[PDB]
Design a protein around this ligand. Structure first.
Ligand SMILES: *CCC(=O)c1ccccc1
Length: 273
């Protein structure tokens, strides 16, 4: 119910009516202000509470980032309060995987959004780390949808859909999802798995992502990548202390919220180095 707190956090100043332009402006403000991060699962802190109060406490009041369940959870509550009709969906991540790869777990969550006067439903995803669409996408197959960054495309895959994006020089399948509404409890089960399981990439490693000035800032451990329209520059971070500095400065995460910096640096040192 802390609508004001959220809007100030994302530095939004426009209108609040449930329209297409507002949805575009909110998604752009959210993706540019709240970083993607897995500092909680990395530090052995599970992501179990997906209520409006818990997510606003962390992502707004404490100035932290989060992952898919936290990002799409928070924006989903905000949009519902503004008058948008929000349906929470579940997805399986297939990024960089070939078509014959083993069936992935349902560890991603996206939103199907409608509003007064809309021609059709819209896909909203502000929680897909390094490749999250910075614009609401028409929930329709075949159409190429250009954003402020990469172009996106949805295609019909079996009993559901698949979101694809043109990364570098080829169309890459990001995730496959069903358009069926999933209850909150199913999302909690998925979030528990991805934040506690010893095999999860969010437990074993560090991942951080943001968007700032027509560019994508992606961090995989000590590997920082800045993806621009022109090209990509890669920076190999020297030590765990420099990694924490990047998380605080470049990514705008309140690192002090995690606890003693020495413990976070030691965890990054043992995991990334
Ligand atoms: C919650 C899952 C999530 O945020 C994610 C999965 C796979 C790749 C990027 C982000």
């Amino acid at each position: 119910l802390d609508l004001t707190g959220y809007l100030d956090r994302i530095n939004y100043r426009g209108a609040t009516d449930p329209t297409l332009d507002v949805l575009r402006d909110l998604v752009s403000a959210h993706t540019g202000a709240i970083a993607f991060e897995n500092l909680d699962p990395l530090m052995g802190v599970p992501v179990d509470d997906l209520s409006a109060e818990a997510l606003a406490d962390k992502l707004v009041d404490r100035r932290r980032g989060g992952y898919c369940y936290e990002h799409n959870g928070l924006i989903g509550y905000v949009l519902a309060e503004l008058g948008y009709r929000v349906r929470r969906l579940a997805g399986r991540v297939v990024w960089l995987a070939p078509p014959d790869a083993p069936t992935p777990a349902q560890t991603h969550t996206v939103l199907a959004v409608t509003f007064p006067g809309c021609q059709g439903p819209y896909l909203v995803d502000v929680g897909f780390g390094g490749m999250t669409p910075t614009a609401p996408l028409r929930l329709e197959t075949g159409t190429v949808q250009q954003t402020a960054l990469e172009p996106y495309r949805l295609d019909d895959r079996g009993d559901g859909l698949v979101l694809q994006a043109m990364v570098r020089d080829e169309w890459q399948a990001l995730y496959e999802f069903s358009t069926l509404t999933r209850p909150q409890v199913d999302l909690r089960v998925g979030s528990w798995f991805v934040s506690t399981h010893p095999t999860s990439h969010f437990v074993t490693g560090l991942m951080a992502a943001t968007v700032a000035d027509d560019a994508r800032w992606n961090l995989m451990g000590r590997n920082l990548a800045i993806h621009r329209r022109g090209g990509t520059e890669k920076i190999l971070l020297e030590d765990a202390a420099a990694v924490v500095d990047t998380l605080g400065d470049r990514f705008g995460i309140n690192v002090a919220d995690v606890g003693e910096r020495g413990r976070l640096e030691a965890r990054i040192d043992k995991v990334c180095f």
